[PDB]
């Protein structure tokens, strides 16, 4: 059991190395490789650890981050940069991983060695594509900063004008790269970044402030401002359409389904605007004093109607939960 116990200790050390890579940046294969070897099985154990590292790179994907909310314009660029850095570290790790002794172990029975070596070559390719994606990601990160920096004050009246140039830079980015892998997949990331940025801006405009205004019912210009924020959203879509014409073919995007998230938020906001405008009209009705022909009974009926509207506001006005959440139906 002495040698078996030593092998178990080596496996535990490999697991610790994998844990460091998880908290740390991979490098499981270096930990897997045997140290000061005098057997053949021990070298095979090191090889198995190397296979896990290639699987981890494949497991990470842009789509998985998008599925779990997130998908911010700054975040997508950061994820690409992190993936490129991990691939670069893995490539540097592979050089260290591909030792003279390691090559000899592969020669002494060899299909498993060939599968990891091919996986490493694929990572080197995927890694070059990732580096191009990372340069694109840095450009997107600058775009994200021009949005992340925002203190949620104004911005839409300026951001809408700024949206067209930002869209134009992305159009230029596809042409400059040319060999950029997963170009269609990257588009999905873009639309997700735009919609995610728009949602944060929309929440700041309404949320508690929108509820406080409706309850007071002394603000109208603010209701117009809510429509203006939606316009900014429409301008981004218009700019995106304009970008497609400028792009000339290979439109991709899939906004119809990809833009449904953004479209759903706008539809909910539009319904509030349609109802908010009606509430302003009801306030004017209370002020009206026609005093024509029959009097008082008509006014009492009008007064009840004005009260009726206030009663509806008290139900809607209380707004338990709600707050115009796009997710809440």
């Amino acid at each position: 059991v002495a040698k078996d116990l030593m092998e178990k200790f080596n496996n535990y050390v490999a697991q610790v190395y994998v844990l460091l890579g998880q908290i740390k940046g991979k490098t499981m294969l270096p930990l897997p490789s045997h140290k000061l070897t005098s057997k053949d099985k021990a070298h095979v154990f090191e090889g198995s650890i190397i296979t896990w590292t290639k699987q981890i790179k494949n497991v990470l994907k842009l789509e998985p981050e998008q599925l779990l909310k997130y998908g911010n314009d700054p975040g997508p660029l950061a994820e690409i940069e992190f993936w490129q850095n991990k691939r670069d570290n893995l490539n540097l790790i592979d050089s260290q991983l591909k030792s003279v002794e390691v090559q000899n172990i592969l020669h002494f029975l060899k299909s498993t060695y060939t599968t990891p070596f091919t996986k490493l070559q694929a990572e080197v390719k995927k890694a070059r594509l990732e580096a191009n994606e990372n340069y694109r990601y840095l450009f997107t990160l600058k775009d994200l900063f021009s949005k992340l920096q925002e203190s949620q004050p104004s911005d839409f009246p300026t951001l809408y004008e700024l949206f067209i140039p930002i869209m134009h830079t992305i159009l230029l980015i596809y042409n400059k790269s040319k060999t950029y892998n997963q170009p269609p997949r990257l588009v999905v990331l873009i639309r997700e970044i735009c919609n995610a940025i728009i949602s944060n801006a929309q929440a700041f405009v309404d949320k508690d402030t929108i509820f406080s205004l409706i309850d007071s019912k002394e603000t109208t210009e603010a209701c117009d401002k809510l429509q203006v924020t939606l316009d900014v959203c429409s301008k981004f879509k218009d700019a995106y359409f304009e970008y497609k014409a400028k792009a000339g073919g290979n439109w991709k995007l899939t906004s119809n389904a990809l833009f449904v998230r953004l479209d759903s938020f706008l539809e909910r906001c539009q319904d509030i605007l349609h109802l908010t405008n009606t509430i302003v009209q009801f306030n004017k009705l209370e002020k009206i004093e026609l005093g024509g022909t029959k009097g008082k009974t008509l006014t009492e009926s009008i007064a009840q109607i004005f009260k009726e509207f206030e009663e509806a506001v008290q139900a809607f006005t209380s707004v338990s939960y709600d707050i115009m959440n796009i997710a809440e139906k």
Binding site: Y135, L138, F139, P165, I166, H168, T169, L172, I173, K176
Partner: protein, 50 residues
């Protein structure tokens, strides 16, 4: 009714003031200048890795 009549007079003034001839054209010129500046910046961004 007089207050409502006063609002209508203000309504003509709001449209005449807020809306002006070729308002969109002035906005488009500003957008074109921003696009040209962005294009120059993007070329510089492309240059750093190369």
């Amino acid at each position: 009714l007089e207050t409502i009549k006063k609002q209508q007079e203000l309504a003509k003034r709001q449209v005449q003031k807020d809306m002006g001839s070729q308002k969109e054209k002035w906005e488009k010129k500003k957008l074109e200048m921003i696009e040209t500046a962005e294009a120059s910046f993007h070329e510089n961004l492309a240059k750093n890795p190369v």
